[PDB]
Symmetry: none
Amino acid sequence: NCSAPCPQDWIWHGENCYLFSSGSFNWEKSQEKCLSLDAKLLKINSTADLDFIQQAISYSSFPFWMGLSRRNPSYPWLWEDGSPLMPHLFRVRGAVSQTYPSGTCAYIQRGAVYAENCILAAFSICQKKANL
Amino acid sequence: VANCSAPCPQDWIWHGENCYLFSSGSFNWEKSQEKCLSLDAKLLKINSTADLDFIQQAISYSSFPFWMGLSRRNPSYPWLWEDGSPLMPHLFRVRGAVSQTYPSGTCAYIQRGAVYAENCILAAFSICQKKANL
């Protein structure tokens, strides 16, 4: 039967559905919440994804976890699906030389992307494919 | 024609019978009202606690205030939506600038998980709403 591209409360953009979290949680809790909704943490494949996300953030100063992480600085930045961060999308600033017990994760804040201890709390964005 | 359509346009949020647009245009209450009208929509109108719960949840990541369609000329008048209907009781209290009189009236905005009163000529984001294609 015919269905809506995205569920209620989500934002439909292009081929995907986006959900902004209602609160700040650590990266692992944020990951768990996207999985319970048959979604994953935000994955940026192009500058157009980053531009839509920043437009949707609507000038918020808060940090938002995305699905990019690494165990320590010897490992490359990977998305939850194991694929690497494609070059020329964004620079990862901040805590890029330290090793934290629960890993280092990326968040977006005021347009720029920062690396931080995964146990710290931030808002997050979930995404899943739209029904098209 | 006779084909299936999406309940809401892209960049809007579908909730219940309506579509919501959280516009990041920073304009006064009258210009924000005008922009909603140009999109076949009106400024946000909250009819139930479920509407307020959805709105507060949809804007808790935002640090900025959002105009809604509630207003009054001055403190002697009750709060009224764009359609002339009153603020139904047991929904929310309006905090902030509730004793002053501004030349272009007083308008309400939502922020901090709460509704505040402010001078209508001031600039803020706004929430538009229209009926979903159901």
